[PDB]
Each structure stands twice: as structure tokens, then as C-alpha cells.
Symmetry: D2
Subunit: 504 residues, 4 copies
Amino acid sequence: HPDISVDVLVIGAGPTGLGAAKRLNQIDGPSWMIVDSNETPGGLASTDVTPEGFLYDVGGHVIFSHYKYFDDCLDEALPKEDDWYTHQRISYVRCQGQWVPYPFQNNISMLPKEEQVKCIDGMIDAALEARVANTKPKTFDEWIVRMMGTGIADLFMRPYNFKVWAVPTTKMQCAWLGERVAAPNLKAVTTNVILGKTAGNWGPAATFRFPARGGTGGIWIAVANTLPKEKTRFGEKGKVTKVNANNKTVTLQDGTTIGYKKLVSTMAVDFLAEAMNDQELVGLTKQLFYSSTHVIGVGVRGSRPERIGDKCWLYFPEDNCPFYRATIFSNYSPYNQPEASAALPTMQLADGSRPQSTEAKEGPYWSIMLEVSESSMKPVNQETILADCIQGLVNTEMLKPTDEIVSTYHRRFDHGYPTPTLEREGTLTQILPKLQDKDIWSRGRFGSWRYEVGNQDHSFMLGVEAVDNIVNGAVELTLNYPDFVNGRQNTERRLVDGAQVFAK
Amino acid sequence: HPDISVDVLVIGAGPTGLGAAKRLNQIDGPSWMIVDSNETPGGLASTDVTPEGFLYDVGGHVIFSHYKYFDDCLDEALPKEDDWYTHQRISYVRCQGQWVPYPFQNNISMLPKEEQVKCIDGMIDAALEARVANTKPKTFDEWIVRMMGTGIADLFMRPYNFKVWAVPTTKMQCAWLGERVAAPNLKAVTTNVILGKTAGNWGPAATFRFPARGGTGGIWIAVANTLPKEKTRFGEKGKVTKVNANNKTVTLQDGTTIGYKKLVSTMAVDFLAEAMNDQELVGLTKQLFYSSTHVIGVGVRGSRPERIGDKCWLYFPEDNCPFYRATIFSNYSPYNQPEASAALPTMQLADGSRPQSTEAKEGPYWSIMLEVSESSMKPVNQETILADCIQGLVNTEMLKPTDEIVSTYHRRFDHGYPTPTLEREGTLTQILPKLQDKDIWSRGRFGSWRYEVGNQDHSFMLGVEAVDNIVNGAVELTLNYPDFVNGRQNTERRLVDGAQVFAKS
Amino acid sequence: HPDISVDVLVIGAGPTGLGAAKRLNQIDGPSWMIVDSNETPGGLASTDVTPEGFLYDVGGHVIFSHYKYFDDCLDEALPKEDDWYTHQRISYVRCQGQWVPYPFQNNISMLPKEEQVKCIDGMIDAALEARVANTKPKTFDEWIVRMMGTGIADLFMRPYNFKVWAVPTTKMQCAWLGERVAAPNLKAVTTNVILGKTAGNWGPAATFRFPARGGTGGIWIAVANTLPKEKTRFGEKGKVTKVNANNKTVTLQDGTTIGYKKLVSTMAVDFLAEAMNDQELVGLTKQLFYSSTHVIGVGVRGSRPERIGDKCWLYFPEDNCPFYRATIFSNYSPYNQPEASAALPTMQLADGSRPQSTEAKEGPYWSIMLEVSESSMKPVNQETILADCIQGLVNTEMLKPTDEIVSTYHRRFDHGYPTPTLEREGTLTQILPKLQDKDIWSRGRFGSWRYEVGNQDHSFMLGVEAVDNIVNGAVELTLNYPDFVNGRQNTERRLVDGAQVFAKS
Amino acid sequence: HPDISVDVLVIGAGPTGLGAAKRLNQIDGPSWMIVDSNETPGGLASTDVTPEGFLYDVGGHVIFSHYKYFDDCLDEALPKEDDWYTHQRISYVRCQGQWVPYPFQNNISMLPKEEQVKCIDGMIDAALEARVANTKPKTFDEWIVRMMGTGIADLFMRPYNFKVWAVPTTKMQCAWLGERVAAPNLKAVTTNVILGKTAGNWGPAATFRFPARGGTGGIWIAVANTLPKEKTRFGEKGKVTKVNANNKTVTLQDGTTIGYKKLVSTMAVDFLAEAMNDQELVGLTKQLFYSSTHVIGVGVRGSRPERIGDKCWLYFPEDNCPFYRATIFSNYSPYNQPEASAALPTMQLADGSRPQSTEAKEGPYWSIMLEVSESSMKPVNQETILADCIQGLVNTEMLKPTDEIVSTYHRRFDHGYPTPTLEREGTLTQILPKLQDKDIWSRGRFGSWRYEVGNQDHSFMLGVEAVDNIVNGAVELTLNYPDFVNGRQNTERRLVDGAQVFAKS
């Protein structure tokens, strides 16, 4: 008989696992337990800090919540108004020397006139074709061009998406974008071109909140802390090494065995198939595709340059830089980098030069966070990528050659994006029902591998809904119907439900 | 303090209310109680019997379940195999002296050739227009025309639907439609006309099960029997007369008061507004529309005639009869009518005349159940409707003039169909949230007034999900997303869920 | 027996009749003669002069020739290079204080940003509707909206066309406009908006030639002069009063009778019906519609103003002036107005005041020619129309308040435009074949009433082709197929054909 | 100075040349003469006779006239009523053991049901595509499929047209087919299928007349005979061997030289280029494409079989026979074959066996005329083609194995069809203008190489209009605008025009 027995075991304490745990904790029915190999919960929603005191998330993390329940747990965890900062959702596309407001097509007035002509002509073709279309697009590429036309597609979404996904747009499905018809808003686009108008999709209503301290990672430490500590096992002692699906037994690295009746696994599903020693599942998970993410962080001396201003995140379709996205992380919280009086030496100038002096000087400081994707179709030279990113910062006029870099950061995350390939659904609908037959609920960004429900709130709710299905017979809506949950505000499920009110 | 206090009060013990009850009973958390003014649970899913021993449902009731939870509760209530009879879903449309397999719009093949031309020409126009359409249809009529063309619309869809809904197709919305009206492929319809093929949509997979005894009403009597009796109050002692929403207090006819934390109300929402003495809610509910259903039953002497055969239900678009639908109710169970040795005198011949003898004679017997709709746009002469129906049976050749009728039944059900009018949703999105703000879950066929989720399984689950929302913060999917629940197999929620498994150890 | 007998009698010596006479004269087979009530041939293609020496055509007359035959005859009649001046076809549309290059609908790029949006949005709508359109437009208005969208329709097409046709766009057909109304290309128009460019000249017409002396009327005086004088009868002596179609006899006002075998009538067909004393025909011609043309002439002291420059004709859709078109007639020939040394007193200033003195001062002089339409749907105040035009010239900034006016001219031409009404073709197909069966070829701008073949070259060729049909069995292509003759270069028929070349041997 | 001088020389006395000659003769102006290498006029519109007395045209020749002038000349040539026979235009398609009335698609109810399904499914696809089409088809093959859909295309027009043109449908243009939109009449086709109806496109109105004697060739003998004999030169004495364009001189085989001012050439334009010894033109003409025609005649003993009946011509898409078209030539005139009392021996039975006797036996007789095409893409074994044709008659059940054949006929015509290749116009617009610059009017079926104006009436009028262009400056409509002349009733040009009427006074 096992060392420990619980009704429901949760593997992994990123957002998905912590969602499952919060719901089990609230229900307070079946016994339960959560394990993670890391001492610190959060998964890919964690945060690092450099020796010089610059924080970096695992790339740009901006919360948009589709669920009251998710909101309830964040409010519980970080309940003070000064636990958070609010910002507008300000983003731009870098294109031919210009910062073009997102969405790109509504702002092509900034481009040269001859190019505007090409863009409008292409979108006219797409509008005329959309008017008689009687089939759905089958690939991401087809969807892009039917929405945007050839010209606008070639400038942004085609080269941008290869830089992000590390696979061509022709090899991805397009159902994950939702059920919106692939057609141009020709009038809107042409109107701004005629008016010479620019317009971003943000304002006092289009906002996000970001944690005052600890980066995105601070949220999940705070949420985890609301759980009964004896029901958690985090660290080397919590690393899962073996899953015996037939005996419903799990073995940890230190040899501890855990028996379960139901399993919620939030580890990557290809790792799960190995831990199970299931040759059939290993073969199937190997049919899936993912990209790795390099996160590069750069700490810069000086007050925030006028050219940067209130920018939050930025897209880079062009090939003069390796990164697809940059984040002005110092704009998210004053505590993402040291205060102005902190003294740091200059490590190098942006052009690669040595500084005049080695003396530690004061701030203030700002901070840029970069993302570079990697796959077997898009290799990344690990040894030069930092320097390539810094050159890319100069090329894109984010840094001057003279800017003083005081901190650098580079980390590679093996599983970064689960790719919406054409083959994905054919594979997942074999994998997930086989796990289900064994009472294994494999869920999460890489637990169930669906990018369109792959953010923090989706993940958290995948765990919540998994538990609700296990206990109360709930439909796993986020898992099976992304369009459904993304197109509504999910208000019904709360951190305090009728059941707990009636109980007291 | 009131006579009784419960966390959750359920008003009504038709399928919706019973569903609430069953889920509350399964959860076994909050205290609850269920009331009904009728001693026998079942609502519009009840069954009547004539003095001569012929059973009649409230019109044609055929079960198609979208939910394993519903299946579970029926199986629990009627667990034996001989509790049920299984049949194929055989229906036809009476059209110009002939029985056309349902769906009509696919058996074009069976009409006079000249009419086939008319139909196919119309459908060709519709196919070409559909090729360039970029707007959705706004009315039931526009929808019908767009998917079938004028010829088929006129021959069947338009007249039949006025006969059922008792309002013209131009007066109804079309969002409710996915699962009720078949949209014909031009190539499929044309292929069947060329091949001279008649192809109805039934067979070994498309079946239904019907209770062996007690009619459809037998289900809900048995389901109710699985509830703890003390938590029920059925009869005059359970008739709700006043609802004080602000004090969260209900008053019954005998004067009993019941306090509640949450209310699940399954009575017609216009009745609820009146019981609340809420003039604003009364005015809103009056913007809703419903039709009444007349149910007529006819018991016939004789073994089942060949011309009837295995027919289950039948549609009547034409003018030679007042009913829109007939059910061969004696095909559903042998216990829906007397055994063959039962002796019964003839009451009349089908042609209206007196029988040659008034002596009681033996069977066998078969049985027809007819439905006639009524509204302010379609008045019905209540005094002659029985005789009109019987003449309609002679007219459609279902009865011979000389057939011997041994039993008759007629009952009017005031609230029969909640009409999907153009105005329905604008009104409901005022009514339901205003009740919601008062912790009142108004749910069911007339509780929430949505016909597209108005069958027995829909109703039952409206009750279940209401409770699940109240207790576990579940999404009321059936209520707000008919297309979602009707388009899938709903397997997740069971009569035994993990909660009960884990608790019992 | 009548006073005169010819094989072919030609009535009218405008372009159409002169066309007939020239071809008859070239063929030199059948006997013929041509009559006109006017001593000076030319009809609506004539020219007046004011006592102060300013010439005015009957409104803006610019020649574009579709036929080599027409070229040959103009060349014969006015053979010297200094008989002609050549000009670029420079026109603009007055809109919101701006001059928009013709055609308006292709130069959206010139309007304010706000108006550009309204225009392009409209054109996008039209482009998308046109992608799935399977019916041709019935009316001029439907055509305008289908091809240009509501924005350009409201801003220019609808007001301008009522102002010139003197009927709403909804009352006209749209089969006539292939060569008159440009259909805008969405990509092309949008591309020029983005680049802020003007559009390439619509049509093959880049320049035009205009006669050095006598205005447009000089051409027809000279063409007529090439005819044998004995075969003409112009003046009171040549006015037709009676046409006896059954006797094939024509009576002139002086009592002269002319018997004919074939008749080419170029007078207005409604007048012809009257002269025929044919009540049925009069009835039919009254189903036709026409507008009247007021021509207003204004002679101005001064060297040609910079704001005027090389402008030729100008369009005015706006309601701040009565005229639909202005022509800088002084740009067409130096001899359309007096020498600079000619001394003329100021008659009035453009603001309407009397001048300081009666002193005759020298020039130079320039000249504006205006057109105002009239019909039963659009009355014109004859007594004030001159002053209204002059104020119009001030509102449109064509004249400064202080500009000195040295000559004025006003003349009303009752039949100005044959209106392409919805009813036109139905009526003409009852009229023209009836006349045909009586050996009457009724042809010309009002002879056959078809504006799309109603220019000088068209008219001339209607007379030529009518004679060719009569003598050589030719197809009357211009009469029956406007799109055919307007869409090709008609090079085959010449002033010297093979017949004449061989015969001279 | 040449042996003979004329103003206009016409080469060739087939229909085109005779048209030119008839119009020259009528105009009676410029001097002219017509030459031909054959003593008998008619060209490809001539008629042969076998030693047994069976006549054969050059394949099926049926007159549909688009011109009054053509009717005038035919009626002048053969003015008596008994010079002609009148018949309805009765034709069928041989398909899967059936004679299917033309047009094929309106008669597919004769096909097996499963095949009707595939045909109608294809045409539904075609109609749905046509509804949103925004481009014209570019090839004959695209035109066929857009009009018929795949299934119907594969059964008739695709395999049939390869058998006719001896080139694939994918290699031909489709503009020659005219301006009608390539689109299905889906309602018409489905209606006849639903009704089980067959219907040909003939009846009392849709008739042709055929000469009573001498076949089609009789027409042109009679027309030629109205010409003044001394202006003709037919036979070896009239064969042109050299054309010197730069000197406007023609040389005949007997050494006679003719000087002309204008040349109308109706010989094949590739021969003309060789005769001109113009290397550039020879290169260009070699870019053109044409098929050769084999004509096979079979004379059969017996009264007309019931299975043949009133059939006139027949299409053969299938590959169980080499011919694309058959004509029941004995149905055109009783004088196309010997009278019944004429005695002929049997040459063979249709299955190839010897007759039991070689005695002459009497008739009556009927007659079949067949056409086989030949090109480099589709060779013909001249040695076996007769035997293959006769086997084809058995395969198609036109002849029984036992039918007695009393006469056979085979002749190959090198220039048979001028092919409407994709490249044709690109080449012709280089050839015809260069010849035009030399005062050479190259006109006719192979004179101008355009099949869509390649019938007898078209050809005759090409000559007429060429002369009219030379003399009177007429537009050459038939040459340059096939759609125009084929879509109208051409009634203006007559054998007696005004010119002749007036001159005779």
C-alpha cells in the first residue's frame, strides 16, 4: 500500500494546478494534495530576478480575465488596492522606421503612400472575394489573407507569425482564432487612410492590472499561500518521476508513493506519457508540436526615453531583430527594477562598447524584456542570442548606441508555445480520451495543449473545471469549447458558492 | 416567523420541478421542499384516462433525451425492461390523399409530377439566392422560404405551422430552429425525385421508448416516488396562492407560509407575476404569447387496420381536418387501451350516426390522439371541436364511416405552447433578470417560455441546472444556450457524481 | 401634278439634312432637293452674334467625330489650316469653392477629406453589391447608384442631371449613357485619393478643333455652300407647312408643291406629325419628352483673367446659379469676340450696377456662354434669367463684382434636348416604323429623338445613312445601334468612294 | 499591259465569289470578271453523284439564312415552288443505344436514372458557379462546362467536338460561339427530367428548304447562270497560278494575265499566300489550323426503315463509329437517289458479306451521308475508312447486318473546317490587314477563315459586302462582327435596291 492516499492528486502548481487546488480547497469534500518539482509555485507564470535586481517574467504576461472566479482568487490573494497597478493596453507594430499602433491595418496611413495603395488594393480584392465566399479557411495563412488581403498580410501577420510560432502560417490551423468570419473591414481601414488618421485599440476602458511586487510570479505565490500548507508538496520532494496508471500510483523522486482515485496532471502531456511508460501515448504525444521561448532581459540606465513613453508591448515582423515581441517591463511596476538611488556599474553600451568608467553610478533605470522563439524549423544560436537581441534593440531604435546597459538576463524555456498545427486536434482527440479512460485529467497550457485557452485565466479555470467535473459533473467548457468561454463573461462560478453559504 | 423554512423552495412538480427536486435530493446539502396544486405530479407530461379505459397524454409525447442525467432518473424510476416498449420513430405527412414520409421536404418524390416541378423550381431559386446571401433571416417565414423555396413553403411549411402555432409564420422569430425543421439539400431532394425514392429518417437507431403502463404520466409519478415524502406537498394543500418576493415568503391556499432563501418557480411566469401582485411583472408577462392545446382522444373497435400499421405520429397541413397532428396512441403501449376481451358498447359510428346495436361487445381496440391549437388569431369552436375532429378522421381516411367509436376524450389545456414570437426575447430579457434579482429562478416550458428547450428532458434539466447554479455556481446552459445543449451529448452530470462516491467512504 | 418632282426630298438643312444632301450629291443618281425655313443653314448648330459683335453658339458645341465621312466633309468645306483652332478638352466641375477635374466621379481626390470618406464609402457599397448583381438597372438613377454609390449620387450626379435634363434621374432610362457617363473604378479612384492625383482623361478625346470664323455655324454654312444652289430652297420660300404622306406631296408656305418618292424629314418629329395632320401620330409624339435650352451670353472687358485661364467648359451642379454649364467661348476663337481696339461702353457691372459713364473704352474682351434648361418639371423666369445668370457668375467667382459687361445675349430654343425617358423607346417603336411604312425617313436630333446619337457627327451621319439605306440598301447603323457606331472608328464610308473613282474612268 | 483588264477581279466561284459577282452584276458599275479552276461553280457547296446514281453534298448541308439578299438570289435562281422541298430541322444525338433529341440536355430523361442524377448534380454545380461568375470563359472547354456542367459535358459536347474539330476542346477559343452567357437553364433541364419528357427544338416554324434536284450544288449552278456568261471563266482556263500583288496582276494556268484595280480572293488564304510568293504571309498562314473532311456515302436498298423515320441529321459523340455526323440524305429530296423502279445489284451487305445473288433488283432506295474529320492530332486511314464507316452504321443500329448496300462513295476534302483555335485571331489580324494594304479582299470560309461566319449564306454575303465596301464604302459587318449579323434580321440590302429603281426611269 502507498505512502500517501488521497482522493484527488494534483500534479503541478502553475496556474492550472493551483486552480484545481483552490476549487478542491473551497469544496472541502474529497481529500486532496498538490505536488510540484519547484519550491516556488507559478510555472511559466513565475518571475526571475537578475543579480542586479531586475525582474523578468517568462516573456510578456498581461492578464485579461474571462472569469469572475479567477478574479475572486486574485482579489483574495492580493486584496489591497496598492497590491496592483493599472495600465492601458498600449501596443505598437514596428514597421519601416515607424511605430504603428495596433491593430496594424487601421494605421497604415503612417506607411509610404505607394505602399498604402498596395495595401488597400489587396484588401479590396479580399472584400470582393469575401462577398461570394462559400467555404471556411482551412489554414492560418488562408485566414490571414482573407481577412487582410495580400499586401497587409505580407507586411505584418505573415512574417510576424513565423517569428512567433517558429512555423509557417501555411502549416497551422485557424479554428483557434474563433468563429469570426475571415473578411476585411474595408470601410474602416480606407477611412483612416483617407483621413490620415491613426487609432490604437485602447483607452480608459481597455486596461490591465499588474502586481506591484514580485512580477506575475507574485500572484501565484500569494494564491498558493492561501492553501493549507500540509496539502502541498513543493520542491525536489515534490518532483514526480513515475505514474503507474494501472495501479493509480505516483512515485516521487525521493521514492515517496502516492495513491489516487482521480489524477489532475498539469505537466506537459509528452512528459506525462514518459512518466507513465506508455509507448502508445509516447508515440502519440510525439505527433504534437511546440516551440521553445528564449527570454532576454536588458536593464538600462536613465529615465524613460520620450521615444519609449507609455508603450507596453511591441511587435516585430521585420528581420532586423531576432525577437518577435518586446515589453517595457519597467512600465508595469516601479518595483520591477531597482530604485533610482541604487548604484550599479555599466556593463556595456548598446553598441557593444565598454563603458568609460567601471564606477557604480545611480539610476533611474528602465527595463526591456524580449522574446525569441525556437523550433526545429527556426534554430536559435544560444551563445550569440543575447548580443543579437541587443543589436536588434539598436536596429529598431529602441536603444541608442550610447545607452548604458546595467543588467542582462537570458533563459531558455523548453516548452514555450503549444503550436496550433493542422494535425493538433487529430492527435489530441486520441491522447486525451485515452487518459480520461484511466481517470487522468490532463489539463493546462501543455497539459491539454490548446493555445486559444492557454493564458493564465484559462489555465487556472481548466484546473477549476477539471475538479468540478470530477466532483459535481460540470461540463469542462474551457477545455472543449474555447469559443464559448472566450465570448462571454463567465460569472456563475464564485469563490463563495451557494454550497458554502448554506453549510454555515 | 413562517410555518416552514427551507433553503430552496420548488414550486411545481412537473418535469422541471421534479428535476430540481431530484438534484437537491442527490446533493443532500441545503434543505428543500417541493409543492404542487395537483395530487399527481407530471404537469403537461401527465396522462388522463377515459371511463371506458382509454389513456391519453397531453397530446403526442415522444421522448428524445439530450442528457445522461435524465436517462439516469428515468432508469432509476422505471428500472425493469418490461417497464418500457421500444418503437421506431415512424411519422408521415398527410398530403393530397397520400402519406408522405417525414421530412416532407425530402419526399417530394411522392407528389404529382406537376407539383414536383413547382417544388424543385422553388428550391432552385432558393439555392441560387442562398449562394449570394449575406444576411440572416429575421422571421420564421423568411427562414422557411430561404431554405425550401416557395413551392415547398406553400404546400406544407406555411399552412402546417399556422395550424400548430396558431400564429402566422411571419410573426415568429427563427433562432429557435436548429433541431425542429430540416433544411433540404437541393442535390438530395432532386436526387430522390429522379430515383423515385421515398426516404424517411427513422430506423433501428432512431427509436424512442414509451412507458408500458400509465402513459407518459407514469414516468413522473415513478420519479416523484423516489423523493422523500415529507419534503413534498402535492394537492390542494400545496397550491401556491401568494408570493411575497420581498419577504421571501410563499403562502399556500390553506394558509401555510413557507420561507425560502432561494425560489425555483416552474409555474407559468404570467401566473407567477400575478401571485407576486407585481404590476410591472404582470405587464411584462402580458407581452408574451402562448397558444392553447385541445386534446381529443378517440377509442375505436377493431384490430389495427392495415392502412394504419406501424404509424406513430402524423402531420396534417391541409384544410379537411382541424387537428395539426394525430398519434396512433395504441401503438405506443398495449396498456394505453382496454384488453380485447373488454366489453364496451358502441357510442357512435365515425360518420356521426347511431350504432345498429347498443349492446356491449368485445374488442380488440385501437386509439387515436389528436391535437388542435387555439389562440386569439385562430379561434376554435369548443362546442363542435370533438365532432369536427371525428369528421376530420373520416376526411383523411384514418377512419371509415362505419368504424365504431367506443370512447371519446376532449380536454383544453390553456397554456399549451410558448410561442417563439419576434418579441419573445426582448420581453424575456426584461422578465427573467428582474426575477433573478429577487433570488427567483423562473424555469420551465412556461417558467422560462422557450420552446426550443421545452421538451421533457429540457424541462427536467432546467430544474436540475437551476439548482446546480444555486448550489455549485454552474452555468445554466439549457436556459441560455439551447443550440449548445441540443447540439451535443450531455454526459457529464450523473445521478451519481464524484461528490456522492467520495462522501460514502 | 405638283410644281416640283424629285426622287428624294430632304426637309431641314441642319447637320442631319445636310448629311443627306451631301450623300445624295456624291452619289449623283436619284434626283433630289433640300428645303429649310431658315435662309442660313445649320439648325441648332448655328451661331448668333450680338450688336456689339460677340458670337454665341446654341450653347457649348464641341466636336468629337466618330466618322471619317464627317471629317471628309468638314475638310472639304473648310480646307485651310487657318480655318481652324485646336484646343485641349479642358473641363471642370464647380464644387464647394473648388474646380474638380472632369469627370467628377473619377476625381474624388480633389474634394475635402470628409467628402472623400462619404464618396468612397458609397463606392465600396456599390462595388460589393455589383459583385453579386444579376439584373441590369432600369432607370438612370439606379444606374448612378449601382455604379457610383449614394455619396457621389447625392453630391453630384442627381442634382447636376436634374439641372441639365430638367427631369429627375428617376424618370430617365439608362441604355443611352455608355459614352456620356463615366463608371468609376474603385481601385483607380481610391488610388488617386491616396496619392492626391487627378485622373487620366476619360475617353479617346484629348483635343478638339473649332472653326476660326463664324462659330460652329461657319461649318454648316460652308458645307451647304458645296451643294448645287439650284437644288436648295432656304428661307420663307422653303418652309414646309403641309405633308401629305398618302399622295407623297409636300406643300410649302408660299404654296409650292413638291412630289417625292422618298422623304427624309429632319424637322422635329412632333412638328412632322402636325404637318401630316395625322391625329394618331400627334398623339404618339406627345408621349415623347424634351427640354428647352436658354442660351445666355456675356461679353466682358479685360484680358483673360488668371482664374479663368485655359478652361473650356465648366459644370455647375450646385444651386447657387441657374446654369448647368458655362463655356469660355472666347477661348475657342479670337474671332468669337471683337478686337482689343474695338471701343465699347460698359453696359453694367457684374454686381448689377450701372457704370460710371457712357464712355466707350477699348478691350481686350473675353466671353462667357451659359445654358439653362427648362421643362414642365422645371419652369424658368424668362424675364429675370439674364440677371440671375450674371449673379450666378458672381456667386461662382467666375466674375468679380466690378467686372465690366459690354454685351448680353439671351435666346430660348424650345426643342433643346430630346430626353431619354423610360417611355422613349416604347413610343419611338410605334412612331418610326409607321413613318417608315409610308416611305418617310424621320431622322435627326428631333427627327428620331435619340440623344446618344444626337451630336453633329451623329446627326450628319443619320442623314447620310438614311440616303444610303434608300439608294444602296445600307444598314442604318447610327439610328439603331448607338453603341456600335460610338464604340468603333467608322472609316469605311468616304466623300470619295470606289463608285466615284471607277465612274471617272 | 495584261491580256485582260477589269476594275474588280473575283477569284473563286463558290458561294463567296458568286456573292461578289451577283452584287457586281446588280450594281452594274465597275467592270468585273470571275474565275474558277472548276468548270462547275459551287466550291464546297457542290454535289457529287456515284455511278449508281446517288448524290452526295460535301457532308450535311442545311441552309439557315440570316439575310434577305441571300433569299432574293436563291429565289431568283430557283423561283418555282417545286424547285424546293421543305423539312423540319430534325436532329438527334446517338447515346448509349438511344436516339436522343437535340438539344441533348433537354432529353436526358432517356438515360438511365443513376446517370440523370450525375448529370443534374453537375448542372447544379454549374448553375451555382454561374450565379457568382465575374469572368468570361477563355476556352471552348470552359464554355462547355459552364453551360452544361461536367456530367452532361462528358456525354456529348466534349467527345463530340473532338470528333468534329479533330482538336481538343481545351485548344479552341469560345468567342466564336457568341455573346450569350455560358450558364445552364437548370429549371428547363430538371423540369423535363421530372416529367419524363422528350422534346426536340423543331416544329412547323423551324424548317429548312432543300433543292429538288442536283443537291445543294444545284443552287449555285442556277445562281451562276444568272451571271452574264462572258464575264465568267470557269475550268482549267480559269485556274489562278500566280498573284503579283505589287503589280496588281493575276496569271492563269494557260498563261493568261488579268489586271485588276481591286482583288476579291476566295481561295484558301494559305494557297493565296503561296500564289503571291510572299514568304512573310506564307509563314503567317502556316500558323493557322484546319481539319480535312472525309465524306462517305452509302446507298441502301429498301423502303425507309421505321427506326430512321423523318430524321435529318445525327450527332455521334461515342467511339463505336468514326464519323461525327450522319445525314439521311434521301430525306432531303426524292431525287437524291434513283427512283424505285431503277435496277441495281447488291454490292455488299452491311456486315461485309457477299450478297446471295448479283442480279440487279429494283428499289426503292434510301441514302446515308457521313462525315469523318482528319488532322495531325487525329489521323484517318484512307484505305479502311469506308469499311469502318459501314461497320459504324451497324454499331449504331442505323443499318441491320442484313441491309443491302448498292452504292458507296468516298471523297476527301483537304480544306474542310477552318479551326477556331486560341491562336486564330492573333494570326488573322496580321494577315487580313496586310492583304488589305495591297487592295486584296481575302474573304470566305477559307478566304477569311472564320467558322462562325462560314455557312453558305455567310460566305455569299462576305462576297456581297466586300463588293459593297469596294464600291459604296459599306461596313463589312459579316467579316468583322459575326455576333452582330447572326443576331439580327438583315433585311435592308436587296437584289433590287433604290439605285436600280431610280435608274430605270
